[PDB]
Design a protein around this ligand. Structure first.
Ligand SMILES: *[C@@H]1O[C@H](CO)[C@@H](O[C@@H]2O[C@H](CO)[C@@H](O)[C@H](O)[C@H]2NC(C)=O)[C@H](O)[C@H]1NC(C)=O
Ligand SMILES: *[C@@H]1O[C@H](CO)[C@@H](O[C@@H]2O[C@H](CO)[C@@H](O)[C@H](O)[C@H]2NC(C)=O)[C@H](O)[C@H]1NC(C)=O
Ligand SMILES: *[C@@H]1O[C@H](CO)[C@@H](O[C@@H]2O[C@H](CO)[C@@H](O)[C@H](O)[C@H]2NC(C)=O)[C@H](O)[C@H]1NC(C)=O
Ligand SMILES: *[C@@H]1O[C@H](CO)[C@@H](O)[C@H](O)[C@H]1NC(C)=O
Ligand SMILES: *[C@@H]1O[C@H](CO)[C@@H](O)[C@H](O)[C@H]1NC(C)=O
Ligand SMILES: *[C@@H]1O[C@H](CO)[C@@H](O)[C@H](O)[C@H]1NC(C)=O
Ligand SMILES: *[C@@H]1O[C@H](CO)[C@@H](O)[C@H](O)[C@H]1NC(C)=O
Ligand SMILES: *[C@@H]1O[C@H](CO)[C@@H](O)[C@H](O)[C@H]1NC(C)=O
Ligand SMILES: *[C@@H]1O[C@H](CO)[C@@H](O)[C@H](O)[C@H]1NC(C)=O
Ligand SMILES: *[C@@H]1O[C@H](CO)[C@@H](O)[C@H](O)[C@H]1NC(C)=O
Ligand SMILES: *[C@@H]1O[C@H](CO)[C@@H](O)[C@H](O)[C@H]1NC(C)=O
Ligand SMILES: *[C@@H]1O[C@H](CO)[C@@H](O)[C@H](O)[C@H]1NC(C)=O
Ligand SMILES: *[C@@H]1O[C@H](CO)[C@@H](O)[C@H](O)[C@H]1NC(C)=O
Ligand SMILES: *[C@@H]1O[C@H](CO)[C@@H](O)[C@H](O)[C@H]1NC(C)=O
Lengths: 342, 682, 158, 49, 49
């Protein structure tokens, strides 16, 4: 937020009165920049766990498990997974995420768009340091490392292991001896390929990933629109237009009306910044939870109940989403419960 | 951090010279021209021969206008504000005379006459004088002259140097000399030289006298924002011109003189509007104040005769000797802004009351007049004019016109008229339309004799009521319209609606009566030119989204700028580069312009390599301050911009029947730091 | 203000200072509350890390260190704590040829704590984190069913 | 929180001055309702496993 | 205020009360948001436990 452009605009009279008023501007911006670097630290702590960009192996079948829907697709410019392509569509992101250049609002024919109703009033949107293609490079490295090494690349160097020979231990970890896998390897691989097909087709109908990710996109966008509309409040002055006061009244009497607008708009900025700090804390909590879930479900196999999935955790796969992450949790779920005497 | 009139850093300074007839190889010259003042002057002069004596200040430099004069002669300095008739080429008199009974007889060759002197000041002589040598200017004297609110302010400094033909670089802080209350309009000025060789001029008409290479420098002050650093004694020891370069702009948003390595979002200390604009409609006709204020008869207060004032120019100057106003009170508008405003509707409301009742013509008043006769409203937005009129409304027998109401069953509402003339039964018995016990005729006639106290004398009141709507203007002030600069971030004033922004031809369509349009935020974003009917839109002068990338002020002083969301070809148009200092255009055009996905990065050399990120620019690009000694021979460090790397690319050798099993381990000990508490305060 | 103006006019100027100073204090207190929450979160994380790394050995990945957690030691610091995490980090990564369920005597043989590595024409069994091969005995192995495992190489299982 | 009842009570004069003043009331209530549904989500996430 | 003063002068005194009470509401709402975060943390801990 540029302080003078929001409060005063282009007004040497107002810009002079804001000087002797106070030095809140520096304090307000110190808080907003602390939030901004935290948004990059969150993404780093979630996605840059491994610093080795493992290439996806040229093999595409691992004992029957397909993986073609969660691995990167090399056809289109975005080297994202089929499902990651499906996730970046359910989130509208009708905001400054879609770039609006400055020349788009200089030459205009009908009415000024809100995106530059806030631009012309000192409210800018900084872009994230990591490109959405860099997030996809990090997730593809994690999937490769996982499906080709298992436990090993999180605790050290990647040690190659056959996949079905790996799912044997994944079964040994939940209390099921190895032979149960090899004796059901084809049925097990089929049950796995069907569930991913189900999540794929279900990520095309109801728009439920929109739940928590679109909610934070709508929150941020709405706060800026509120901050903009609040420039039409009088706050006790004879007008909410600064050039109306400056046209009718002389400096001694115009300073009384301007100081009301200055106080009201400084309060509006302070409210915005406080709400942003609270939401930044609420999202840092979720980012820490996601950084824990990655290292404990993708780089390992957790014994914690209901932490990675619902049943007995086997493995997990990360998928990048706009301003977030998606975890595909694979569990065991025994279902037959035949009675016995014991 | 203050906004005031300052001499910009690295600004143009004009260099003037003299004859030096004893050093120009038998060649002379006479040039100390008349220069503009322009909101303040910076004057510096390296000299050795004490040839500079003082200055002249004024507008016409004739007897028809007062002027100011400063002459430091030897002992004491003389400052006079008289009416001088200066000569076309003024200079001081004697130089010296050795044992001829004429030692230091300084006669003024400056003015032919001095009259009607108002101010006179004498004090000790400025920095130093009476030196005589060559090849070294052992004294640099600087002066800043200001003239604001009647006072003439001089600030000076005196430093010893030894140079030849250079205004020496370095920092300069001038201390206040004098604040003189001379109160004169000052527009031009001129320097006083001491040119004499045993005589002022030659035998008949030439200089042919001592000319010791007089040379001075002149700079002009501009409205700027500076960041000053006061020391323990209160002396300014350092400053920053916030409008100089991207680095100064950063040291001003962070009110500090040292900047750490990083990228900083920046406030707009960049552009300043230089010219203003007035565009009023064609009215060219004066309002009928000669017949509104100067009439044979006015209305009675109860029949107060509202009339309207359509297309005309409201110039209250015409009534200055015509009438004297005892009351002139404006509501919702200031009396000093009535010249800069245009109104869409105006009304008159003229009547006559006694002198003691003029106070009852304010919004929230009570009384016989404010209750039963006139009753101004609460949100008035107008001016109330009143003036004694005993010379026209008083007769030697009495003037029994101008009735007034005294009895009414309820207070009048705002701007309501009443001529009911019924009988007003005061008690409870019926009135039957007959004046009797409790039945009074409600209108009574004022009696205005010439032998009355100033409380019972008649007063003519005029109550102007105007509004400011989006309609076209009808009444305008005496402001004179200027041209229409429509690209250059000016101050504007169209129909009394002021502002500051960039005017530009618009494609918006207005209704036939519309004069301006607003936005989601109640800010004027388009205005109609009332002289060409053309609609043109307004753009802010400030461009937001400028981030300055610096490697630290204790490491270097070269920076890179990031113009967020701006095409690299439209940077000079977005920041208004032609209105910036030359040290700003270095960062609008460039040898190395790099268009990132965030914006245009100007100042850094885009390399094709990749490193771990040092200063995050955004959208995948980071930047750092790397040396080039291995990149080029005798190469200095610079700022590079690269696409950061996510780590070493690797590949796993996977297959159906191959496993890797470790043969050795490595016990490692890593640290983890967690804050547990913070300082508790009360 | 109190020197130049009288109480009726000084109260107007003082009430402005009172309002702004109260707002300055309110802002300070709100920022302090937000930072106190952010530091209570870290203090809870440290109270979890102590009881789960120093008073125990955690199986959680990357919770106490980087590799496989062995133990941890606390060190006090100004307004905080330092943890010295000791991990395992296996590092030599030599390749081998492996296969599950060696088929001997018409029955499958799966290992307990093993992966069935193979030398040149020789087969053994090793624990996953450290190369230590044994002979395939009846106690390094359990048996279940016929030989239908997708690879099932042939061996002795003495 | 009903905004006008706290600030103004029953005062058409005050209720008219609060209108042109500003629209914080709506943003104030947006925050309090987000808190209220979170209190139900907490209880659900704890007990309706 | 509304009994003793007229609208032009009563609006000056009312705007002070409006500002003060709006600030009082904003302080309440900010404290409620902070406590709601502190209790959402505990509710998540209980849902984990
Ligand atoms: C040089 O400046 C001196 C400053 O003292 C002035 O001397 C005055 O000369 C006038 C006559 O012109 C006398 O009436 C005053 O008595 C002198 N000054 C004093 C001592 O008050 C004078 O303005 C300049 N020129 C001369 C003649 O010295
Ligand atoms: C400025 O000087 C002029 C010229 O001397 C003054 O005008 C004369 O003033 C004298 C002195 O009272 C009168 O006797 C003359 O009748 C005036 N002449 C004319 C034609 O005006 C004038 O008074 C001076 N003004 C000031 C401000 O002192
Ligand atoms: C406007 O006129 C109405 C009607 O003539 C006035 O109301 C009457 O006031 C009289 C005297 O106070 C009462 O006897 C009647 O009962 C009222 N009639 C009604 C319909 O209420 C009213 O006072 C006038 N208002 C103004 C300010 O002039
Ligand atoms: C794997 O997935 C692809 C794409 O969904 C599908 O067409 C195919 O039937 C699956 N089988 C293979 C080749 O493993
Ligand atoms: C037997 O199993 C069924 C479901 O498997 C269960 O509903 C039932 O209660 C069990 N016991 C008896 C006695 O039926
Ligand atoms: C300033 O000086 C430069 C360099 O000598 C010259 O090119 C330019 O015309 C000067 N500008 C002004 C305004 O004097
Ligand atoms: C202040 O002034 C004194 C004497 O005028 C001088 O000695 C000192 O160096 C100055 N600067 C300070 C005290 O910082
Ligand atoms: C102005 O008033 C003076 C003083 O009565 C008078 O002499 C003069 O004629 C009037 N008119 C003008 C145009 O000065
Ligand atoms: C005012 O009225 C008088 C009538 O005596 C007339 O002579 C005069 O010209 C009018 N105008 C002015 C400006 O005095
Ligand atoms: C007003 O004046 C300008 C120039 O003085 C002229 O071009 C224009 O036609 C006039 N009329 C209108 C309606 O602008
Ligand atoms: C920048 O402008 C050039 C020329 O006008 C155009 O070719 C290019 O596509 C533009 N790029 C952007 C990002 O605006
Ligand atoms: C960077 O690589 C591109 C790709 O060919 C090339 O066009 C450009 O000249 C290179 N720039 C430098 C500075 O090496
Ligand atoms: C063998 O091991 C090395 C490192 O131990 C590894 O780089 C390689 O991919 C493995 N496989 C082959 C076939 O070399
Ligand atoms: C394991 O590594 C250490 C590291 O120096 C080495 O000294 C030791 O001999 C190695 N053990 C082996 C090769 O068995």
């Amino acid at each position: 937020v540029d302080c003078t452009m929001y409060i005063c605009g282009d007004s040497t009279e107002c810009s002079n009165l804001l000087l002797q008023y106070g030095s809140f501007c520096t304090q307000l911006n110190r808080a907003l920049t602390g939030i901004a670097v935290e948004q990059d630290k969150n993404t780093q702590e979630v996605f840059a766990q491994v610093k080795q960009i493992y290439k996806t192996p040229p093999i595409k079948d691992f004992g029957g498990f397909n993986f073609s829907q969660i691995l990167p697709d090399p056809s289109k410019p975005s080297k994202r997974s089929f499902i990651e392509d499906l996730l970046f569509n359910k989130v509208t992101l009708a905001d400054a995420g879609f770039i609006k250049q400055y020349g788009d609002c200089l030459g205009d024919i009908a009415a000024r768009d809100l995106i530059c109703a806030q631009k012309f009033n000192g409210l800018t949107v900084l872009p994230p340091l990591l490109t959405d293609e860099m997030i996809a490079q990090y997730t593809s490295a994690l999937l490769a490392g996982t499906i080709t090494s298992g436990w090993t690349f999180g605790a050290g160097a990647a040690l190659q292991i056959p996949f079905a020979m790996q799912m044997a231990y994944r079964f040994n970890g939940i209390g099921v001896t190895q032979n149960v896998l090899y004796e059901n390897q084809k049925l097990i691989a089929n049950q796995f390929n069907s569930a991913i097909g189900k999540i794929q087709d279900s990520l095309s109908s109801t728009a439920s990933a929109l739940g928590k990710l679109q909610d934070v996109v709508n929150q941020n966008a709405q706060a800026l629109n509120t901050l903009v509309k609040q420039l039409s409040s009088n706050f006790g002055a004879i007008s909410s237009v600064l050039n109306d006061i400056l046209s009718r009244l002389d400096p001694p009497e115009a300073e009384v009306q301007i100081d009301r607008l200055i106080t009201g708009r400084l309060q509006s900025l302070q409210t915005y910044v406080t709400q942003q700090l609270i939401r930044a804390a609420e999202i840092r909590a979720s980012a820490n939870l996601a950084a824990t879930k990655m290292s404990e479900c993708v780089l390992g196999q957790s014994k914690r109940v209901d932490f990675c999935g619902k049943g007995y955790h086997l493995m997990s796969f990360p998928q990048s989403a706009p301003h977030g992450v998606v975890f595909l949790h694979v569990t065991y779920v025994p279902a037959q419960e035949k009675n016995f005497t014991t | 951090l203050t906004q005031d009139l300052f001499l910009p850093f690295f600004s143009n300074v004009t260099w003037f010279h003299a004859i030096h007839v004893s050093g120009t190889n038998g060649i002379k010259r006479f040039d100390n021209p008349v220069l503009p003042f322009n909101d303040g002057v910076y004057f510096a002069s390296t000299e050795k021969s004490n040839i500079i004596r003082g200055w002249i200040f004024g507008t016409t430099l004739d007897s028809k206008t007062q002027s100011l004069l400063i002459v430091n002669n030897a002992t004491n300095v003389v400052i006079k504000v008289c009416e001088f008739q200066f000569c076309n080429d003024p200079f001081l008199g004697v130089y010296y005379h050795k044992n001829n009974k004429s030692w230091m007889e300084s006669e003024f060759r400056v003015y032919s006459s001095a009259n009607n002197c108002t101010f006179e000041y004498v004090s000790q002589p400025f920095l130093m004088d009476l030196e005589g040598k060559q090849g070294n200017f052992k004294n640099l004297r600087e002066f800043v002259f200001k003239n604001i609110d009647g006072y003439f302010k001089i600030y000076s400094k005196h430093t010893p140097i030894n140079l030849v033909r250079d205004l020496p670089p370095g920092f300069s802080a001038l201390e206040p000399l004098v604040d003189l209350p001379i109160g004169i309009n000052i527009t031009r000025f001129q320097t006083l030289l001491a040119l004499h060789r045993s005589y002022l001029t030659p035998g008949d008409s030439s200089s042919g006298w001592t000319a010791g290479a007089a040379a001075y420098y002149v700079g002009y002050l501009q409205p700027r924002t500076f960041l000053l650093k006061y020391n323990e004694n209160g002396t300014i020891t350092d400053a920053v011109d916030c409008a100089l370069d991207p680095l100064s702009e950063t040291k001003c948003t962070l009110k500090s003189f040292t900047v750490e390595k990083g990228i900083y979002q920046t406030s707009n200390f960049r552009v300043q509007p230089t010219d203003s604009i007035v565009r009023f409609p064609n009215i060219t006709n004066l309002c009928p104040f000669g017949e509104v204020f100067n009439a044979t008869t006015f209305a009675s207060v109860y029949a107060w005769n509202r009339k309207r004032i359509s297309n005309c120019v409201a110039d209250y100057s015409v009534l200055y000797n015509s009438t004297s106003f005892s009351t002139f009170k404006c509501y919702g508008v200031s009396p000093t802004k009535l010249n800069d405003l245009c109104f869409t509707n105006v009304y008159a409301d003229s009547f006559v009351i006694t002198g003691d009742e003029v106070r009852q013509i304010a919004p929230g008043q009570t009384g016989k007049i404010a209750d039963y006769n006139y009753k101004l409203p609460d949100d008035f937005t107008g001016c109330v004019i009143a003036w004694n009129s005993k010379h026209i409304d008083a007769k030697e027998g009495g003037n029994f016109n101008y009735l007034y109401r005294l009895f009414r069953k309820a207070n009048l509402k705002p701007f309501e008229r009443d001529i009911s003339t019924e009988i007003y039964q005061a008690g409870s018995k019926p009135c039957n339309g007959q004046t009797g016990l409790n039945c009074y005729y409600p209108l009574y006639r004022y009696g205005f004799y010439p032998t009355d106290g100033v409380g019972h004398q008649p007063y003519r009141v005029v109550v102007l009521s105007f509004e400011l709507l989006n309609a076209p203007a009808t009444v305008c002030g005496p402001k004179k319209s200027t041209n229409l600069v429509k690209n250059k971030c000016v101050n504007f004033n169209f129909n009394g609606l002021t502002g500051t922004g960039v005017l530009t031809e618009s494609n918006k369509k207005f209704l036939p009566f519309q004069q301006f349009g607003r936005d989601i935020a109640d800010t004027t974003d388009a205005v109609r030119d009332p002289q060409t009917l053309e609609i043109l839109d307004i753009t802010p002068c400030s461009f937001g989204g400028v981030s300055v990338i610096t490697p630290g002020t204790n490491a270097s002083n070269q920076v890179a700028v990031l113009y967020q969301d701006v095409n690299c070809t439209e940077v000079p148009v977005a920041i208004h580069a032609d209105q910036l200092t030359p040290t700003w255009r270095v960062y609008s055009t460039g040898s190395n312009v790099f268009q990132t996905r965030a914006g245009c990065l100007i100042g850094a050399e885009h390399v094709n390599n990749s490193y771990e990120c040092d200063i995050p620019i955004g959208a995948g690009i980071c930047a750092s301050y790397q040396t080039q000694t291995n990149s080029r021979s005798v190469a200095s460090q610079s700022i590079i911009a690269y696409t950061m790397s996510l780590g070493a690319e690797n590949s796993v050798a996977y297959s159906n029947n191959s496993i890797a099993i470790p043969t050795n381990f490595t016990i490692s000990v890593t640290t983890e730091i967690l804050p547990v508490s913070m300082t508790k305060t009360s | 203000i109190l020197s130049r103006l009288d109480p009726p006019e000084a109260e107007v100027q003082i009430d402005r200072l009172i309002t702004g100073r109260l707002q300055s204090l309110q802002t300070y207190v709100t920022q302090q509350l937000i930072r106190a929450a952010e530091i209570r979160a870290s203090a809870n994380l440290a109270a979890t890390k102590m009881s789960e790394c120093v008073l125990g050995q955690s199986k959680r990945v990357d919770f106490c260190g980087k590799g496989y957690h062995l133990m941890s030691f606390p060190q006090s610091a100004p307004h905080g704590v330092v943890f010295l995490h000791v991990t395992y980090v296996p590092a030599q990564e030599k390749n081998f040829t492996t296969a599950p369920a060696i088929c001997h005597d018409g029955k499958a043989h799966f290992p307990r704590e093993g992966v069935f590595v193979s030398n040149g024409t020789h087969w053994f069994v090793t624990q996953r984190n450290f190369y230590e091969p044994q002979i395939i005995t009846t106690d390094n192995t359990f048996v279940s069913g016929s030989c239908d495992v997708v690879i099932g190489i042939v061996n002795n299982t003495v």
